[PDB]
Amino acid sequence: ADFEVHMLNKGKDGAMVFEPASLKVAPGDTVTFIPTDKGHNVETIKGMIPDGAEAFKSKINENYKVTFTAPGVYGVKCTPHYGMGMVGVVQVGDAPANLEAVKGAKNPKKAQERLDAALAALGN
């Protein structure tokens, strides 16, 4: 199954957001990150990727397609707007083994407020 995540300058959650900010996919699913507005990209957050997973970083303005292979929770950010809180969470499969470790990862304050909300919406 294929899912879409859009990158916007303004959404229901405020400025510089990923929509949706939290998504549960299955092992092997594909998510396409699409900058609806210009100036955004997607990159994995340091310490918020499962064991076995490869980090990634898309180019600004590109539609980025990723097939998630290793199960667990992945923290993602927009490079330029990470300090402003532009972050999302992708859970791949059931019972993420790295769920406790991603909760402890350190992020700038606004990014931390949105990641905690997003982890809570997954039922974590």
Which residues in this chain contact Cu ion in the complex, by CB under 5 A?
40, 78, 81, 86
Q: Is 48 annotated as a binding residue?
A: no
Q: Is 78 annotated as a binding residue?
A: yes
User: What residue type is 82 in one-letter code?
Assistant: Y
Q: Is 6 annotated as a binding residue?
A: no
Contact 73, 90 (CB under 8 A): yes
Can you count the helices (H) and strands (E) in the chain? 2, 8
Taking the complex as a whole, the smallest distance from the CB of residue 97 to Cu ion amounts, in Å, to 29
Taking the complex as a whole, the smallest distance from the CB of residue 68 to Cu ion amounts, in Å, to 21
Taking the complex as a whole, the smallest distance from the CB of residue 81 to Cu ion amounts, in Å, to 4
Contacts of residue 106, defined as CB under 8 A and 6 or more positions apart, other chains included, come to 47
Query: Residues marked as binding for Cu cation?
Result: 40, 78, 81, 86
